Amino acid sequence: DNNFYSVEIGDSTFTVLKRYQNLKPIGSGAQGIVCAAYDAILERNVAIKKLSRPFQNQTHAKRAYRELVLMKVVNHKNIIGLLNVFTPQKSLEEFQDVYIVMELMDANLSQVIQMELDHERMSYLLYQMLVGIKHLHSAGIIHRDLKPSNIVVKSDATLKILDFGLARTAGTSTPYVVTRYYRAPEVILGMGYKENVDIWSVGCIMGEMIKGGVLFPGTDHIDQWNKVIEQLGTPSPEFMKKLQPTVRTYVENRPKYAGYSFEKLFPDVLFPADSEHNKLKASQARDLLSKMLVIDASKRISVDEALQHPYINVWYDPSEAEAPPPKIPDKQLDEREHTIEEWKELIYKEVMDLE
């Protein structure tokens, strides 16, 4: 009799097209719980992200709009794929919930990080993330929250970036929104950010992959900064000058560190057999780690730079890497103020635009 319908998953209610069935719970996006579901029609597994009354809040509104926009506009081998979208409410009046259906992968990095990969594998995955990130940048978008949980794999050894709710263009202009262990200095110390902020994230992931556990823990947001400097050592004065004077003080007050050499943070012991052919060497990986994990954002390698690094570029393929930027409707410029009403309506438009 009706097009949608509902299942209670614990305490949360999913109301979804009869096509989607057998919901299990699986994780959380920036916003929304998320179910795996079988899509009877296309006869394949899918993932579905319930976004509850997003216009409830500038944030939820903003972060939602983003995802919708960015889930449609972006298309790439390495970015998670839009499959379907909808609302069950049949009228702007009535409206509250959005649902995004997207491809479901086999696992996230958690996961892979535990096992002992071999250079080709690491270098490859790396490569993929990067190209993925490259693609987003090529249209100004900075992901901002790259971490094992946002990255997904499949057993055909392929990789996809995911979750766009947090993504935008340069900073500053809320501090504690990006995951602690993955924060670049410029975000820990609130200097604002350029694309290569994502590269920081990358470095921690690669490192974590190798190290077997998180690169810089950090028992709280401030401790985090010790962990970084504990390991990489106190940054130059020339850098401190970039710091806002209030924070600038504290930092200059931190005990000094020399920090370890990369060869010490990442010794051979830690690596697979050095590769069949060259470029793919423990040391080469190290070299690249050492150009990403770099406190000073202005002395830090770019996606493209990384894409060329001997350890990555062995897989380099211009058909993937130099793909057309995702064109973004300038209507939106991802950070202007609005109200509950204008928010609710934007979403609905954008959603109804997408059904």
């Binding site: 892979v112 096992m115 490859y124 052919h277």
Partner: peptide, 10 residues
């Protein structure tokens, strides 16, 4: 260096 096609989420 052939791209891989298997990854072991065993």
């Amino acid at each position: 260096p052939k791209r891989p096609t298997t990854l072991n989420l065993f």
